[PDB]
Design a protein around this ligand. Structure first.
Ligand SMILES: Nc1ncnc2c1ncn2[C@@H]1O[C@H](COP(=O)(O)OP(=O)(O)O)[C@@H](O)[C@H]1O
Ligand SMILES: Nc1ncnc2c1ncn2[C@@H]1O[C@H](COP(=O)(O)OP(=O)(O)O)[C@@H](O)[C@H]1O
Ligand SMILES: Nc1ncnc2c1ncn2[C@@H]1O[C@H](COP(=O)(O)OP(=O)(O)O)[C@@H](O)[C@H]1O
Ligand SMILES: [Mg+2]
Ligand SMILES: [Mg+2]
Ligand SMILES: [Mg+2]
Lengths: 533, 212, 525, 536
């Protein structure tokens, strides 16, 4: 009577390192606790008053940021339920670009309230049905909460005002300047055709002069140098070649079979003459810049230097394609001289040094082009990385605005209005699902609560004020960040607006993740074993 | 303390037998110490894509056919390992398995070697515990499952943590393909089922000779 | 903390959160700044750091010392990063950026301890830094004359101020003149690669020389090299990229013959190819032959027989400098060696320099390059001399870019602190405390100068504050006279952008450090 | 290893000075979260599962294991404050570490430590002088309410704080009971003569104040009565056992007939003594020594309570309270053995009271003197122990107020006033001392800062408003009522603490400054450390 044996049946047949969890307390409550812990970890980095987190991954690489998706991806989350919530957040990041923290906070709140509902007596099926009903109601209500629309995307001022809110949460101190930069970069891109490509905006990070010295260049910047002696062209005539700048060779195997003395003596002379003829034929088309994706032969380099031809070597094919897009050239596969339609043009190409790094600049005089680049300065690599993440968020916001032009008030106004309307609807609904609907409505309060907590005020007073103000009917009212006392203000005048599509997708994904986590009843984990990656 | 230029005369000469007595023992010990050192420490410090033929190779790998199915050679002495690797013809490959009883990832390996021995009679599959060899504490604790391979008296196989690239459910087909990827398994030969045996001995033939 | 059977993160994950984490970050920044504290000003010292292999390095340079430290603290690495950033953008003041950032953090540490919201501190830092940068731009002294003599004197004074903290400070005037003369020859881009720097053991510092041309070490002469004359009074230089050897015509060349006459013809053809290249080079009229690729012994003897000079395996940067000094081109083919592609220098000579042989190209009138030949008693001696010269060269290049100067010795910072205190006296009071703390932290550099020099810092700072309050912008620390003086009249000049970038980088680092509330350390793979 | 050739480590200059500040700051940071009404307790697991939940600074630092000599100085500083004052233990550690931390900054600024020490000594003397002249309130003009208010401040930040309305009256009535005057006619209050008994069970509000004395003892035999209507207490300091002859006496029998009578005397000696004690009418017999079984029977037959193994200190308190006399022996000055009725203490009742499955003696309404005891009821042993520690502080606070009849406003009112005054006064002493005295003035503000930060409020604004109010008091002669303005942690705004009844004994603040200054001076005096390697 000193040991409790394993129960006969499945308990004995289990493997050595395996783990089995079944029932409410062992599985569902524990999953809810894990998801709540994940939400707690990410909570403090929400809103303009969010705090950056120094995260160091297994490779001893330092990340400091407040982007929820980056923080989650830099943490090796082990619990499968939190893994699922992270997958939902990453899916939201991929689909929209902003709102990962909203997804995570909403999922955590929903799961916590689901745990409370299960404790007070409801069933999992009832809770899931209630959340699905409430999510459908919220998606119905959301279009009616739209306050204004973009109504113009070729303008600089309007696009800057629209993009300020997205990049105010990250880099709160200085958002106007970054908004102006990203607005200019996006307006240069996005031609009369309605299609907008996010990848057409490039970011170059050059260290040294503080982020306020960043600028926008209509073209591209490569952290390389020029192989040849020429380092400046004023009427660029780029002739892109995807082949190495050398005489082509046989693909199977080539051996120089010499049978007489004269052939041996004349081989090198003939080869050099052929190289010179090819390079002169290239130069006779007026081309003065040559960009090659392969190696550069010594004799080819010499003959190019003889004819005053700039040489730029691009190691990556993606850079070659981007340069072709931004210049207007075609990546030739042979050393044949380029024809006029394949002839690349640019306003200016030169070699310049920024800070202490030599760069090659392909600059367009016009405020237009296929590809635009943002030269980012700063005093730290991590700071420039954060500025790049903010730039990505702003560009994704611009893309979403291109897809859908509707906007809803931010700063917890939309969440409070949604909670109020869903609570009002839940009263009219009889049956047991009304509790789940009301908890779904209450879960929206975690957004204004997080904003108030991060801003340093009492969340309860802010929430009560928001409910009162929305009770009279001002549905565009959220908390005021620039105040040391709990206060609210109208977001429409303040211009604090977030994309409707982002809210829609974030709510959908958070609800789906919470419901899918709730559906799980048993967990059969296997021995972790190895898995180096 | 002076006269350090001793230039000793016969002391070491007079004790030459006693000196060789333990010098030979130390040489014998460092024989296996150097043989093992070549394994320890250095690696201890750290729809054709779906194998259509894997299944069918599994079924006709169940072709024991002959008498019983035998078992891998078990080595219970380090000197036994040393004087079996030192001896024997170096033309054919010698494969050694290191294991400790109880630890997972062993029985599957032994079954794979058992199945492969029938496929390749030339190979000399054998297994030995890490305890008798004299493996280090780290190698014993978390480096036991390893396929030591020797050919020509020198290492040809440098495999430890075979479960990392094989898991724990790997079959003989998986191990055979993995080894053939590196070109270490000797190529198969055509074989037929003899009645049982023909030959008895080889000596002066004295065959038939019709003479007047 | 109840133990979950299935924990959220991986085992061994370390997480420190809250006010203690930020206080630890500030303390770590202080610790890092202490390691470079005493290397400031004319009375600064040098630090010796030994790597694992035992190769010691001696430096007065803040960025070098910080890099040589194996800093792993995530908050402390920001100071090293901003030091490297200041070195890249400006090249001088790498100690000042770290000192200022750590002083900012130390000044705001008490307010953090009492629960002040970090966003307020960050906003105050941004406002103070913007105001200080605008003040520096406004009160920086510039001359609207572009006079050659005045500009040269300004550059020389800036270089002397930059150099007057290193072991070559005794010869600071000499080295500043050399640096200014070197920089003025660079044409438009002022590329560093166009200023050679060679180091040879033996000799006093005053034996260092600047060659108006190019010089490089002798490169593995073959047999028959000693029969080549070693002085030419108007040589024509044939800069080549050619291997002058008897070798296979091509890597994949195969010769198939079936007659002894053809065999002899092939041998004579190889010899004739080599002799054709050599004869073309000789008939080009050149007297000095330099090749990036090796030059064989046969070619060396051929050139000796013609009273010419050869040198193979010349490093590429040396050939580029020779091109810039003499004015030719690097011909990969000898088939067209026209007169225009041949470099020309007045005198070429090979001399003995401290136990080594160096080839000298002097007398170039159109040279756009130079080469520093540094003499010293030890390897680290020349290394530190090169670092100091690099600092001076960067300062002079940037001063060529723009001639805006502010007086050094902390005078500019005392003026900035006075201005910031004056501003902070006229704001509500939550920002006032933080801006006053910023102004107080701006006084670290004069105090550090006094501490390193061995004065009484408090009295000097009191005198400086009184002088700045009562009038007088450029009054800073006078190290020799144990007192204060007008550093503008004392020619303690530095470019204003140096202080601009120092303040900007220090403010950005302080804001980034303060903005962090949690640190998560995943277990190493 | 160097030319000095000493077997041990060595630290010199700013290296050791920073270590001492780091060590002192570490101790303060331990207890900074246990200060003020919004402070919280701590669990101290004792490596074997023993749990100690406490808020007292002395108790925390006594249990902690410390290694650094500088930290040991502050840990012993807390114990000294507890012994000599009884309250303010957490404040003195916080102030001393803050005094040392600010003094180190001046030393790093090349200010000589002697000047800093000279400045600190001057500031401490003037802070004490200023307190005794402008910040003290005489308890004569307040009455009985000040003692309750002074006590209620003590229970604040303790587990009995919210019920302090009921506990303050219970504490005050206990101290007034044990009061008696001595030579020169100076009343004194022997606090810790109020026996405190812990027993879990009912809520804290059912804690009892016994108008007498309580013993953690029971009657010797179950056959005795468990209640005496009119006790005649007899206190003995010897054992009522079988009489065994001393070591120097030997019993040798040569006539076998004499053996039986000698064995009779081994028990009849004790019986005669007990008969003498009972013949005088004694009902309750309290003894420090043991009692054998047969002797217990004599009290049983007489119907008298007999308690054995009574603590020596408990017996003294009962004898003083009941008027009895401790008798180490039954020997008069005539060489005989007798027990007179004059050596009998009297009480109106003695009860074997039962308290939560355990029983204890209640000696109710002692005559010729007044005595008090307190029984604390809690949810478990863990909370009962903390109630005793909290109650001990309250008894000490009331003792200081009754003896020294001056009080000062609480809630950082004194610290804020001193910071304004000292920094203004610091502008008249040389040049080096001015910085040291100003730092002393600023270092005092850690107390109001620590109270505010515990309540999660804007400590920067509250102290600024608190300092602003005090600044007006020191510059405007007709606005001197602002001296009493302190902190109100419930609402986060300045409040007139004299009206609010937040008081402290003047000795708590004054002794804190003297102890903190000298402790800070001792550490500041060091600039080198030699740590010899242990011989093991
Ligand atoms: N100036 C502002 N005032 C109030 N709320 C703001 C302001 N700027 C942004 N927000 C709010 O912050 C939220 C964005 O938080 P963020 O850190 O971007 O998380 P996510 O990346 O998941 O959107 C939005 O819901 C928006 O309402
Ligand atoms: N002769 C001088 N007199 C007074 N101050 C000087 C003098 N030379 C340099 N300084 C001061 O020393 C400070 C630090 O410069 P230095 O130590 O040379 O480079 P770094 O800042 O890179 O360490 C500068 O701010 C400058 O004002
Ligand atoms: N009701 C109250 N309102 C404001 N301040 C108070 C109140 N009660 C106590 N305080 C203050 O809180 C400080 C902390 O006291 P406490 O830490 O409980 O004593 P100790 O230092 O002996 O542990 C005291 O200096 C006191 O002035
Ligand atoms: Mg966002
Ligand atoms: Mg310098
Ligand atoms: Mg107290």
């Amino acid at each position: 009577a000193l040991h409790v044996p394993k129960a006969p049946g499945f308990a004995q047949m289990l493997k050595e390192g395996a783990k089995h969890f079944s029932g409410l307390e062992e599985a569902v409550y524990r999953n809810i606790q894990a998801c709540k812990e994940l939400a707690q970890t990410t909570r403090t980095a929400y809103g303009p008053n969010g705090m950056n987190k120094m995260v160091i991954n297994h490779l001893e690489k330092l990340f400091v940021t407040n982007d929820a998706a980056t923080i989650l991806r830099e943490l090796e989350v082990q619990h499968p339920a939190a893994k699922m919530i992270v997958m939902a957040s990453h899916m939201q990041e991929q689909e929209v670009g902003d709102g990962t923290n909203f997804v995570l906070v909403f999922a955590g709140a929903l799961l916590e309230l689901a745990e409370e509902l299960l404790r007070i007596g409801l069933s999992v099926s009832e809770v899931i049905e209630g959340y699905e009903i409430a999510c459908r109601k919220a998606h119905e209500i959301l279009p009616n909460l739209v306050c204004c629309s973009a109504k113009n995307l070729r303008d600089i001022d309007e696009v800057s005002s629209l993009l300020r809110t997205s990049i105010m949460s990250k880099q709160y101190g200085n958002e106007v300047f970054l908004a102006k930069l990203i607005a200019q970069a996006c307006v240069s891109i996005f031609p009369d055709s309605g299609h907008f490509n996010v990848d057409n905006i490039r970011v170059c990070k050059i260290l040294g002069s503080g982020i306020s010295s960043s600028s926008v260049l209509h073209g591209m910047v490569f952290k390389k140098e020029t192989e040849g002696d020429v380092t400046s062209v004023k009427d660029a005539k780029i002739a892109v070649y995807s082949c190495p700048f050398d005489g082509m060779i046989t693909e199977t195997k080539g051996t120089v079979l010499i049978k007489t003395a004269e052939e041996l003596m004349n081989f090198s002379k003939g080869e050099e003459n052929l190289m010179d003829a090819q390079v002169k034929a290239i130069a006779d088309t007026g081309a003065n810049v040559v960009v090659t994706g392969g190696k550069v032969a010594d004799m080819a380099l010499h003959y190019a230097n003889k004819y005053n031809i700039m040489l730029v070597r691009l190691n990556s094919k993606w850079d070659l394609r981007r340069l072709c897009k931004t210049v207007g050239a075609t990546a030739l596969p042979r050393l044949t001289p380029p024809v006029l339609e394949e002839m690349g043009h640019c306003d200016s190409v030169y070699l310049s040094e920024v800070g202490d790094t030599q760069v090659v600049v392909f600059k367009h005089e016009k405020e237009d082009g296929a590809i635009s680049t943002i030269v980012l300065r700063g005093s730290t690599d991590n700071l420039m990385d954060d500025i790049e993440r903010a730039v990505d968020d702003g560009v994704n916001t611009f893309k979403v605005l291109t897809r859908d032009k509707r906007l809803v008030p931010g700063g917890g106004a939309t969440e409070i209005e949604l909670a109020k309307q869903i609570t009002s609807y839940g009263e009219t609904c009889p049956g047991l699902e009304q509790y789940a609907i009301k908890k779904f409505a209450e879960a929206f309060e975690a957004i204004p609560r997080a904003l108030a907590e991060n801003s340093g005020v009492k969340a309860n007073e802010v929430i009560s004020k928001l409910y009162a103000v929305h009770q009279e009917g001002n549905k565009n009212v959220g908390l005021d960040i620039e105040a040391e006392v709990p206060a609210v203000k109208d977001m429409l005048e303040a211009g604090i607006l977030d994309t409707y599509l982002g809210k829609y997708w974030a709510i959908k994904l958070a609800t789906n993740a919470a419901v899918t986590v709730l559906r799980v009843d048993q967990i059969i984990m296997a021995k972790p074993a190895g898995g180096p990656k | 303390l002076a006269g350090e230029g001793i230039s000793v005369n016969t002391g070491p000469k007079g004790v030459i037998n006693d000196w060789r007595r333990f010098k030979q023992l130390e040489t014998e010990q460092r024989e296996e110490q150097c043989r093992e050192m070549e394994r320890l420490i250095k690696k201890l410090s750290m729809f054709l894509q779906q194998y259509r033929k894997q299944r069918m190779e599994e079924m006709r790998q169940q072709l024991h056919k002959g008498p019983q199915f035998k078992q891998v050679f078990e080595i219970s002495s380090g000197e036994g390992f040393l004087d079996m690797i030192d001896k024997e013809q170096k033309s054919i490959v010698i494969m050694v398995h290191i294991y400790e009883d109880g630890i997972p990832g062993t029985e599957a390996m032994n079954g794979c070697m058992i199945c492969l021995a029938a496929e390749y009679p030339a190979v000399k599959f054998c297994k030995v515990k890490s305890s008798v060899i004299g493996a280090s504490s780290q190698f014993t604790r978390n480096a036991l499952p390893a396929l030591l391979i020797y050919k020509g008296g020198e290492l040809i196989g440098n495999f430890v943590r075979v479960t990392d690239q094989l898991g724990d459910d790997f079959f003989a087909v998986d191990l055979e393909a993995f080894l053939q990827e590196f070109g270490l398994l000797p190529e198969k030969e055509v074989l037929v089922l003899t009645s049982v045996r023909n030959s008895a001995t080889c000596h002066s033939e004295d065959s038939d000779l019709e003479i007047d | 903390m109840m133990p979950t059977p299935v924990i959220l993160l991986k085992e061994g994950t370390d997480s420190s959160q809250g006010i203690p984490q930020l206080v630890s970050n500030i303390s770590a920044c202080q610790v890092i700044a202490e390691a470079v504290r005493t290397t400031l000003g004319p009375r600064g010292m040098d630090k010796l750091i030994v790597d694992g292999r035992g190769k010691a390095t001696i430096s007065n340079d803040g960025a070098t010392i910080l890099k040589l430290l194996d800093v792993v603290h995530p908050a402390a690495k920001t100071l090293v990063d901003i030091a490297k950033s200041q070195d890249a953008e400006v090249g001088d003041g790498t100690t000042s950026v770290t000192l200022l950032a750590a002083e900012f953090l130390k000044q705001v540490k008490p307010y953090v301890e009492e629960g002040l919201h970090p966003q307020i501190i960050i906003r105050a830092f941004r406002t103070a830094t913007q105001l200080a940068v605008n003040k520096i731009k406004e009160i920086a002294v510039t001359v609207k004359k572009a006079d050659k003599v005045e500009q040269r004197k300004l550059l020389e004074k800036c270089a002397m101020t930059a150099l007057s903290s290193k072991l070559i400070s005794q010869q600071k005037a000499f080295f500043a003149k050399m640096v200014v003369d070197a920089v003025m020859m660079l044409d438009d881009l002022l590329q560093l690669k166009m200023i050679g720097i060679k180091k040879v053991q033996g000799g006093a510092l005053e034996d260092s020389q600047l060659v108006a041309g190019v010089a490089f070490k002798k490169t593995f002469s073959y047999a028959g090299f000693e029969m080549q004359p070693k002085k030419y009074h108007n040589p024509k230089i044939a800069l080549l990229n050619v291997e002058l050897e008897l070798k296979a015509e091509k890597d994949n060349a195969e010769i198939r013959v079936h007659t002894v006459e053809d065999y002899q013809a092939i041998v004579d053809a190889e010899w004739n190819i080599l002799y054709d290249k050599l004869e073309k080079i000789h008939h080009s009229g050149a007297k000095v032959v330099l090749s990036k690729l090796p030059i064989g012994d046969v070619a060396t003897q051929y050139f000796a027989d013609r009273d010419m000079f050869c040198a193979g395996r010349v490093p590429e940067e040396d050939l580029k400098r020779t091109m810039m000094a003499c004015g030719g081109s690097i011909q990969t083919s000898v088939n067209a060696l026209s007169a225009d592609v041949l470099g020309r220098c007045q005198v070429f000579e090979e001399t003995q320099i401290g136990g080594e042989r160096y080839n000298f190209f002097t007398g170039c009138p159109k040279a756009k390059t130079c080469t520093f030949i540094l003499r010293g008693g030890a390897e680290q001696f020349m290394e530190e001399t090169e670092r100091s010269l690099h600092d001076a060269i960067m300062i002079v290049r940037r001063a060529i870019k723009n001639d805006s100067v502010v007086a050094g010795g902390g005078a500019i910072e005392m003026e900035l602190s006075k201005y910031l205190r004056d501003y902070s006296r006229t704001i509500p009071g939550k920002q006032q405390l933080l801006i006053g703390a910023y102004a107080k932290a701006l006084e670290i550099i004069p105090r550090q100068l006094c501490d390193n020099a061995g004065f009484d810092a408090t009295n000097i700072l009191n005198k400086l504050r009184a002088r700045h309050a009562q009038g007088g912008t450029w009054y800073g620390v006078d190290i020799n006279n144990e007192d204060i003086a007008d550093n503008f009249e004392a020619f303690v000049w530095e470019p204003a952008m140096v202080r601009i970038n120092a303040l900007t980088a220090a403010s950005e680092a302080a804001c980034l450090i303060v903005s962090v509330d949690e640190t998560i350390k995943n277990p190493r793979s | 290893e160097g030319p000095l050739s000493v077997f041990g480590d060595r630290s010199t200059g700013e290296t050791i000075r920073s270590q001492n500040v780091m060590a002192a700051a570490s101790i303060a940071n331990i207890v900074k979260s246990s200060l003020g009404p919004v402070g919280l307790d701590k669990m101290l697991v004792d490596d074997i599962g023993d749990v100690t939940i406490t808020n007292d600074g002395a108790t925390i630092l006594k249990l902690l294991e410390v290694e650094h000599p500088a930290a040991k100085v502050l840990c012993e500083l807390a114990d000294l404050q507890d012994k000599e004052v009884g309250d303010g233990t957490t404040s003195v550690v916080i102030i001393a570490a803050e005094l040392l931390k600010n003094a180190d900054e001046l030393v790093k600024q090349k200010i000589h430590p002697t000047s800093v020490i000279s400045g600190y000594r001057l500031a401490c003397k003037e802070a004490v002088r200023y307190i005794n002249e402008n910040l003290i309130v005489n308890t004569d003009e307040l009455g009985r309410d000040c003692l309750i208010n002074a006590a209620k401040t003590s229970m604040s930040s303790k587990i009995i704080g919210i019920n302090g309305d009921f506990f303050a009256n219970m504490v005050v009535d206990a101290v007034l009971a044990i009061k008696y005057t001595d030579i020169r006619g100076q009343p004194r209050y022997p606090v810790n003569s109020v026996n405190i008994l812990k027993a879990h069970g009912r809520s804290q509000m059912e804690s009892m104040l016994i108008s007498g004395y309580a013993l953690n003892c029971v009657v010797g035999s179950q056959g005795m009565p468990k209640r005496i209507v009119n006790a005649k207490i007899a206190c003995l300091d010897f054992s009522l056992q079988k009489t065994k002859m001393k070591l120097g006496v030997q019993v040798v029998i040569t006539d076998p007939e004499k053996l039986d009578q000698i064995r009779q005397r081994e028990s009849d000696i004790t019986k005669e003594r007990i008969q003498k004690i009972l013949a005088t009418g004694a009902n309750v017999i309290l003894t420090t020594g043991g009692i054998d079984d047969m002797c217990l029977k004599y009290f049983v037959e007489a119907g008298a309570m007999a308690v054995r193994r009574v603590l020596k200190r408990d017996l003294k308190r009962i004898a003083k309270a009941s008027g009895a006399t401790i008798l180490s022996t039954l020997a008069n000055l005539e060489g005989e053995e007798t027990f007179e009725a004059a050596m009998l203490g009297q009480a109106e009742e003695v009860v074997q009271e039962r308290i939560c499955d355990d029983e204890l003696i209640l000696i109710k309404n002692t005559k010729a003197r007044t005595s008090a005891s307190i029984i604390l009821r809690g949810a478990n042993d863990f909370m009962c122990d903390e109630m005793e520690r909290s109650l001990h502080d309250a008894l000490c606070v009331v003792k200081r107020v009754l003896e020294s009849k001056s009080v000062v406003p609480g809630g950082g009112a004194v610290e804020a006033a001193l910071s304004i005054y000292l920094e203004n006064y610091a502008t008249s002493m040389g040049s080096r001392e001015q910085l040291a005295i100003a730092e002393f003035a600023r270092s005092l503000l850690v107390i109001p800062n620590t109270l505010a930060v515990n309540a999660a409020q804007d400590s920067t604004d509250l102290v600024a408003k608190l300092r602003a109010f005090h600044n007006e008091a020191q510059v405007n002669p007709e606005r001197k009522n602002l001296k009493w303005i302190g902190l109100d942690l419930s609402n986060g705004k300045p409040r007139d603490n004299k009206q609010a009844g937040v008081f402290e004994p003047t000795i708590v603040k004054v002794k804190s400054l003297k102890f903190a200054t000298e402790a800070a001076i001792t550490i500041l005096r060091i600039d080198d450390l030699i740590k010899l390697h242990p011989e093991s």
